[PDB]
Structure 1
């Protein structure tokens, strides 16, 4: 039954671990998802001028 104690130790160790990691990516990823949109939206602004600028340079 000391072998039993050790078995029991595994349970929680495997279970909680699973659960936390299983959550972890999701959450992080979704913050990534959020941030990603918001940098596009920054970009929008500084779209037009970049092209304008770029267009002038190449011409001669």
Structure 2
């Protein structure tokens, strides 16, 4: 029903926000790894 679809979209956006927040922490380490790998 409509309630199920609304719950699905709410939970999808919530877990997307969770993924974004959990990747924010490791962003800097990832950027440092990319920088050290690219530069010869």
TM-score clears 0.5: yes
Residue of structure 2 equivalent to 1:47 = 27
Structure 2: stretches of 5+ with no match in the other structure:
none
TM (norm. structure 2) is: 0.83
SS of the residue corresponding to residue 13 of structure 2 reads: helix
**Number of positions where the alignment pairs a residue of Structure 1 with one of Structure 2:** 40
Runs of 4+ displaced beyond 3 Å: none
Give me the CA root mean square deviation. 0.9
Tell whether 2:6 aligns with 1:26.
yes
Q: Unpaired runs of 5+ in structure 1?
A: 1-20
Q: Within 1, Cα distance between the matches of 2:38 and 2:16?
A: 31
- Aligned-partner SS, 2:5: helix
